[PDB]
């Protein structure tokens, strides 16, 4: 048995990682999706403040990543991406996290250039009439407090389950004793009812909200409200035919409604572009489906389905004026629509179990995408040449992967070619203020980026030693890249890019009591078009861990070691961030213990950043002038932080 703290997650299958978000993690997460991914090699995070980060996988940011909650997409609605998809996910509420690296599946939606990420809950198994609870409390160094409850009752015909959480922390501060603006607070509550006529069938209905706020150190506005809210329906039938093994059907709805201002969690900077009190409200309405059979016969297994998704965006803003200090809030004016996306697709994956030690797997996807611009005007107002204009395109995507187990050792090998085309997301067509040269606006001329990438690596699942390693090389056509000029404007452009990199990790049981493990993660990119390096690539990262287990208790030690990043393109990046200066390298150290008091109650505790290191991570965003930041100094990471946690389960 013997508990412990999660310092890093290894690659289990080829290209794939799974982990239980419900165990405690050593640099302890700001109960946000991004942070729960820091503990997986190859993920870096852009820091905005105390929480609500924007995750980066293998140097690839944003819509290059598929973040699926229970099966559905959940898109936020800041034009500057304050609410990333992950911003709405308290992972402790979910039951199983899973990541598939590269363009090596087509089951879970379109344009997964960089990888898919699947937050899930297993449906209850009951039988007798009964119940189960499990909960956790966390108390941490900066006013940090976290309640999480998950419970369910049911019998062998149906179940009911509620899950929720409440989390907050005050403004943390760093290694120089600077309070950094970074307060946050989050809660979520979701219910699920499920019907199991017999063990062959299952229908489940689900619903919930959350809210949250967050001061944003590197931004002119803060987030007063991130109202999330979701409906969901899913059907599952097993063993219909003898060649037909299961059929999955799924509908989902996800509403986001965010308010941002410069007066509800700060005051307006008098020397700023917004000395006025401003607020702006935005929302995103997302609707979607998925329907998919999985056939198994002879030596094969084929899953085939379709999916569609519509999503719509609206915004509205406040108004403060000349002679009087009368401020009309953005709830007084009507919503304005600016953008609708639809997407239908069809997909199939065939895997052949050749022999005992060989797996060949192919998959293809055909997607139709389309987008209508509803901005009659542009922000005090200009005319939008693209009003009510539509675009569309058809994007095929697919892959192949060969996997081979070895003669006389517990080794697998695998190589994969993947093609993935991908339509521009809301922030590629609307958030840029300029398009490519000679274009009217980014909406009209921004091409779908198409990446082609090779993936290889290996598993070693021995006894004392467990190692893994995966690499990649690829080229990206029409990569979409923001470029910055001095207000301060952006320009989106298509450019061509080479990318390579990889990650590896090992884990060695020394004695029955002493375990250790390490991990390295590298990424590297090039703008083949201007002959520059690609911007916003995380530098080389290395994590070392020692661990001692002895009956019911566990002691832990962790070194994170980060190289400098010297390949940077200045005044270029994505929608949220640009590059400017080269990263300094650093090292942070941490300890942890955990102790199992009884079956039902375990305790954990950790110090993060023992030696109170002043540092910032390269991708972190530039702090706000009015908040006491110099020109281009980036948001710093926390200093010494203590935390302790208790998990119950009955
Ligand atoms: Ag915003
Ligand atoms: Ag503003």
Author numbering: 66 to 444, 450 to 556, 560 to 723
From the manuscript:
Here, we show that Pseudomonas aeruginosa OprC is an outer membrane, TonB-dependent transporter that is conserved in many Proteobacteria and which mediates acquisition of both reduced and oxidised ionic copper via an unprecedented CxxxM-HxM metal binding site. As indicated by the successful structure solution, OprC contains a single bound copper and shows the typical fold of a TBDT, with a large 22-stranded β-barrel occluded by an N-terminal approximately 15 kDa plug domain that, like in other TBDTs, completely occludes the lumen of the barrel. The copper binding site comprises residues Cys143 and Met147 in the plug domain and His323 and Met325 in the barrel wall. The CxxxM-HxM configuration, which coordinates the copper in a tetrahedral manner, is highly unusual and has, to our knowledge, not been observed before in copper homeostasis proteins.
While OprCWT and most single alanine mutants can be (partly) loaded via Cu(II) incubation, this is not the case for the C143A mutant. We hypothesised that removal of the cysteine could lead to much lower affinity for Cu(II), so that after SEC, nothing remains bound. To provide support for this, we determined the crystal structures of the OprC C143A mutant cocrystallised with Cu(II) or silver Ag(I). For each crystal, datasets were collected at 8,800 eV and 9,175 eV to distinguish between both metals. Bound copper is expected to give a strong anomalous peak only at 9,175 eV (which is above the copper K edge at 8,979 eV), while bound silver will give comparable peaks at both energies (the silver L-III edge is at 3,351 eV). For C143A cocrystallised with Cu(II), no anomalous peaks are visible at both energies, showing that Cu(II) binding is indeed abolished. Crucially, in the presence of silver, the same 3 anomalous peaks are visible as for WT OprC (compare Fig 3A and 3D), strongly suggesting that the C143A mutant can still bind Cu(I). All 4 residues in the OprC binding site contribute to copper binding, but not to the same extent and, in some cases, not equally for both copper redox states. This is illustrated by Cys143, which is essential for high-affinity Cu(II) binding but dispensable for Cu(I).
